[PDB]
Symmetry: C5
Subunit: 313 residues, 5 copies
Amino acid sequence: MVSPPPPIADEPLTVNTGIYLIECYSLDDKAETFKVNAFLSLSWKDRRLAFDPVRSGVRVKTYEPEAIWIPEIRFVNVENARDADVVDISVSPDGTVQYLERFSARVLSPLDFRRYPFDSQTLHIYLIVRSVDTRNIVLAVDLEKVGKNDDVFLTGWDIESFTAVVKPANFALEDRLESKLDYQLRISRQYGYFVIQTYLPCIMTVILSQVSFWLNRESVPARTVFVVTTVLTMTTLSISARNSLPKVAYATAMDWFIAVCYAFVFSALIEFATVNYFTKSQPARAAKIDRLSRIAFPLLFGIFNLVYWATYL
Amino acid sequence: MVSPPPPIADEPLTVNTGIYLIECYSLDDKAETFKVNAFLSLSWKDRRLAFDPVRSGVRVKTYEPEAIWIPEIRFVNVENARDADVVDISVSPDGTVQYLERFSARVLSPLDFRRYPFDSQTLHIYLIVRSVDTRNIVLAVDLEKVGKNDDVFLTGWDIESFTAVVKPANFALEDRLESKLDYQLRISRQYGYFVIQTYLPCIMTVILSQVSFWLNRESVPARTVFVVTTVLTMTTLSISARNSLPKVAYATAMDWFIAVCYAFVFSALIEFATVNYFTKSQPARAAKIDRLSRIAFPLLFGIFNLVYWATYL
Amino acid sequence: MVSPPPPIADEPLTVNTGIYLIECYSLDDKAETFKVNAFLSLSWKDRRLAFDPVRSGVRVKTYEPEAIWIPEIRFVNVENARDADVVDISVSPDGTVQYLERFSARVLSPLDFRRYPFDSQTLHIYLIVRSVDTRNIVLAVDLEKVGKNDDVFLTGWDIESFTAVVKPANFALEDRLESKLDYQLRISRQYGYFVIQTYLPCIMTVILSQVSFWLNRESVPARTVFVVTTVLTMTTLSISARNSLPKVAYATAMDWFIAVCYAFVFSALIEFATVNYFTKSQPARAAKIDRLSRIAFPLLFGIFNLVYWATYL
Amino acid sequence: MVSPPPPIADEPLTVNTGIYLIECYSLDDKAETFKVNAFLSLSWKDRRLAFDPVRSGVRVKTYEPEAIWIPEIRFVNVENARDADVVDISVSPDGTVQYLERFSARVLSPLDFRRYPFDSQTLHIYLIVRSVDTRNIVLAVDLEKVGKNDDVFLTGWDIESFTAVVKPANFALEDRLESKLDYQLRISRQYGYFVIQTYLPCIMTVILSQVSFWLNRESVPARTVFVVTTVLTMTTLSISARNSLPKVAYATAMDWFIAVCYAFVFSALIEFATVNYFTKSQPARAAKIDRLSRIAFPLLFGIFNLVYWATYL
Amino acid sequence: MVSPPPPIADEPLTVNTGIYLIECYSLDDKAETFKVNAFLSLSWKDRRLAFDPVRSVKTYEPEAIWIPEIRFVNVENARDADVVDISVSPDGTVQYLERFSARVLSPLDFRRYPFDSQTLHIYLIVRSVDTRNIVLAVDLEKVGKNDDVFLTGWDIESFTAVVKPANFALEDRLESKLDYQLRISRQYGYFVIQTYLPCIMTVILSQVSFWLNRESVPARTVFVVTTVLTMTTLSISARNSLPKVAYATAMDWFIAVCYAFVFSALIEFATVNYFTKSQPARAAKIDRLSRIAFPLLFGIFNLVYWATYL
Ligand SMILES: C[C@]12CC[C@@H](O)C[C@@H]1CC[C@@H]1[C@@H]2CC[C@]2(C)[C@@H](C(=O)CO)CC[C@@H]12
Ligand SMILES: C[C@]12CC[C@@H](O)C[C@@H]1CC[C@@H]1[C@@H]2CC[C@]2(C)[C@@H](C(=O)CO)CC[C@@H]12
Ligand SMILES: C[C@]12CC[C@@H](O)C[C@@H]1CC[C@@H]1[C@@H]2CC[C@]2(C)[C@@H](C(=O)CO)CC[C@@H]12
Ligand SMILES: C[C@]12CC[C@@H](O)C[C@@H]1CC[C@@H]1[C@@H]2CC[C@]2(C)[C@@H](C(=O)CO)CC[C@@H]12
Ligand SMILES: C[C@]12CC[C@@H](O)C[C@@H]1CC[C@@H]1[C@@H]2CC[C@]2(C)[C@@H](C(=O)CO)CC[C@@H]12
Ligand SMILES: [Cl-]
Ligand SMILES: [Cl-]
């Protein structure tokens, strides 16, 4: 068929859109993609399909997508074109078409890891339509048709809300009008897992590094093993932790925690080296160094943990 | 075509459903997905298709799916629309259509890892049908048509039973009635593998850490090597083990075992540090500490193992 | 079309089947799947297609799959429906259809790792056909049409034989007769690779563990490094080795070898701890322990290797 | 249909091409591939489609691709044939066809890692068309139709520009003329990530290796632990780092940095061995060695870092 | 349609074949597969399609005329092909041209690895129909490869075809098989700096132990033990890149000899330590000789090895 001609001769055709999330899975932090399976509902007026509700003994009548003109609606931030199965098409006596499909798609949406792993994100799904030569087409949001099933889960996340920005973005693209809607899924990460995946190994490794201050200054190899193995452990945990993320330029909150832990551990190494350096000559100085490290380190570390967990919680 | 109109003018069309599991594979603990290949059987009454068994020399007659109306049956908790090959369609003289297809699909079903690796799960397969404007459609379960092939296996699991909840869940979705059935595959994990993957390295690492109490207190480096390497081994086993699971918020039984082992090992480190701290001044105290530790540690560890394996077995 | 009517009115239609392996690749131990690319040949009698060999000056005549009835043959133990390209269809004057297609498929067949890596397996490919309402259909095996190309290889394996069980399994399924053939690919693993992947690191790690008995008893740290590092090496090799297999409940022969090596190494640890425990008081006892160990350990290990390699070779 | 015949009887048909990047993702350094989703716009003259703008009350008129001849345009440096959805086809009264599709494709384009990770690249997308026997076909670039969406991101790169080389490469291939255009996406890597992934572990490992010069020369085991563990750490970081790249023949800037760090650390090992060799006889020599090393090493390292970061920044 | 009937009534129809490599990527050493994207060109004589050039090239759609079913043997799935052109000649000569991509499965010989050369094979095959026997041939004009073809780890020597095909019987029909051969040689330098250097340096490090004071037993223990475990790790790591081949590669030999030298250094340290109190002259002599023999035997070994495999 052809696009619905304008009654006002100069009126844009608006398509009322709605998405209802059925399934949400495969949120890939490294790929910054996730997979979604949902209903897409579109609704518009085409009087050419109108009919008398009394002369015609049918109350609605239903068409197949090949029978009538349907607007070409595309997703923007997606990897391939979605896979969709048309579910239903119902026309009204006045000519109002209500189209309903179920689709799955891999959406590509960038994440802000600065606050990670205490981060919240807004996943975006951009709808777009390109105007034809006969008529301009404009997108709109039917709030009645937006929502998500209750059994929608992201195993690592809390799902806050799924909403749409009602006013669309209309703009020129290659000499035609495009209309783009922004659906927004707000989510916040469940950080507890990482607490026992990285934060505990780091804190315990720092404590282990601090145990060296209580060993006899003359047993140099023991303290060497402690300091060195704790340093290498810190480095390994750092690299391991950053291996979960994409190659982002900035630093995450976990990056800061790990870097400060590395500071404390390397400071323990420098302390061990200084004390050993002063052990023969000036044993009073070395002894005082151990005494102060033994008080300062766990105190500064406790204060640091307090400021950090107070801040990011 | 269109849906069969009701004879009672107000009667819902019920679709008799059945699933027969043929193949079950690719149970991914991290993705909380598994792949299934089975028969789907549907059966309903469409009088329009009735025929004279005598005038028509056929006792059944068979149609192609394009020939007759077939209800749109969808899976809910699936990643993509299933891949199906229609196997057979048999109409009865009275108009009873019996439809049979074979499908494969990737089902997405969440797992409860709290008791892991001693966990049981119910994998769900939700069938759903959406009512059309001419008639409401309702799902039901033909028990004769439910089951699973004997050579169905989950390499890591024992399969208990495959049953269906007979009463469906009917609800409103985007202004239409939907009918949902819940097929339930009950399975229980075979934990033995993990016993030799994680639990043994942990137990042996604890014993190794305890060996340090029997080394001469003056040979500080040896005990340092024991304690430190055992601590780092415990940390490595913990991280490694938790790397097999999805980012669940809670803690598994394995988490508890590993955490208690880590408690014992780090406690052995603190013991070595205390003994070394009291070795020059008050050697009687240090000696008494080792004397008691050699009895307490393996005893508390044996008791703990008793409570744990007694509980989770 | 429709299925060939029976001449005996009560005679089952047999389909003569054959598979000719062209390519065999991607044997996945963890997934218990492999990919196969082969010929499938079917042969049956449809009198409707018969013709006079003299009146018709053609010796065979060939049809397209859409032209004639073709039996719906399905694989059982497969992940998706196969991908098939029809190669040829030739009818005989008497009505004998010979159909030939080339297909690729991902077959799922469980492996028995108990004897691994000295294991042999039977990979299964189950063919099946479902009876229609007009006639019962039964599978059979045409040995002339079974075989494999000589350049068929599964890297890391010896291919013994590819045969078929001639008598099929006929059984009732959802009120219809099904006919199932069992094609069997017998293979045996090439263990030599693992000899240099796991067995040598273990044997050398045991020898290294035994070196500790010859170091001076007063150099406690050296022996500590030996015993501890060798123990951790054993643990690492065990975990690494079991990482190649699926989560099987049982233990493989490699598992037994590694476990016995761990027994010897941990026993060397206990020996080092005992000798160190008796080094100050009763130096004769410790000396005797080292003296005996230096003979017993490598002897018991040699005998063990003798029994093991004698058994599994 | 067939291609538009030439008016000059000898004139080549040019197709005006444009690509508008919508989505850019999955830049795989190891595979040297990336995935792209964009608009492809083609424009050519087919006087067979001309029409009177007055007799025909329409100003453009739009066709389906099956209705009219469309040039076979292929990508060269792609893995599979692209996936395209035709978006619009608009003819002008003069016969000017404007075709617009949206496609996704996996482009294969080699990278120059010599300056990695301080590298810039030009990703190429080569368009090509093969001439038919009725007419030669030539490609051209419509600058109005080239560009990229503002929300185009490579989660690790700065995108400089997306341009086209206007003069195409025309050449003979298998006895027909081929016409090839070169679209060029210029990008430059964000190296900061690697600074904290590899460069910091290396620098800290070097400093740690230098700490050994300040330990008492008599505590030989401590210095041994330092030097040896730092050497193995350097080796591990080197291998790990090169594990991110494809098997390129040449050496990267990171390769040079790591190799120089390895030089400094192994030189620290040789220094420790020499000092230990001269510790009993000629302690003055050993002392002089440590005294000089403590000044030389960190100076040569500082200067080295200055030249390196000055050069590659 | 049906296959072209023979003019001699008993003559086989030959199909002139050619492959032109456009794209070559994803050579997987572990899977022994590679991916190829190329032109396939076929040429044969069908007089039924001949025509008077004066009364009337002319081009058909593949559905319009009979086209021979040509299959690849050593492939995982059937290729994906887009027909590019079909041109008939006045005499009936059909020239068909398609562009295809396929994942070819071809075994590699790792014995000389990583100094190995390989011949990747692409086997074409055609099955004879009941009306006529079909035989394959090679149109040299139609064989080649684009210049910008690269294997990101290999030097490409040549791409040629064996002109004489292999004809044989398969399930009661004649099959005709062509062997296209892509000769390549591996660029070993990467492995030179991935494994061989860590091995050589690990051996040197193991040798440093002979110069430490014999009384400092723990230091030498650290050297020997860590160097041994490093050797083991490098061996396992290296063999993790290859399929589970039965035989041994040249890298296997280099790593095995390095392991021999390192474990020999461990045995030397243990012997010296065993004789340090009683017979210190013997231990001293052992170190004296070792310090000369080890680096000499190792240098000579490297000379023979790199001389041989280059
Ligand atoms: C920072 C630097 C010099 C600059 C690089 O070579 C790195 C070393 C690391 C070890 C440091 C050394 C400076 C002197 C220190 C602090 C010694 C002292 O207490 C001096 O009395 C003990 C450890 C030594
Ligand atoms: C907990 C803390 C201080 C707070 C952090 O720096 C961590 C260390 C770890 C080592 C501990 C130390 C406190 C004092 C201990 C218990 C010593 C004593 O028995 C003193 O009698 C031996 C080991 C020492
Ligand atoms: C097995 C056990 C007890 C049970 C767990 O606590 C683990 C320890 C590990 C260290 C063992 C100890 C038993 C006594 C041993 C063998 C000592 C003796 O030869 C006594 O002469 C040296 C090392 C000691
Ligand atoms: C390079 C070489 C010989 C050649 C291989 O066996 C490797 C060793 C490594 C240890 C080196 C040795 C040469 C002599 C050195 C430099 C000793 C000296 O200062 C000599 O005064 C200390 C460490 C020794
Ligand atoms: C090969 C064997 C015995 C057989 C297995 O238990 C493995 C050990 C490994 C350590 C070897 C030992 C034999 C005796 C050696 C060579 C000692 C001597 O110099 C003998 O004087 C030092 C290291 C010892
Ligand atoms: Cl579905
Ligand atoms: Cl393309």
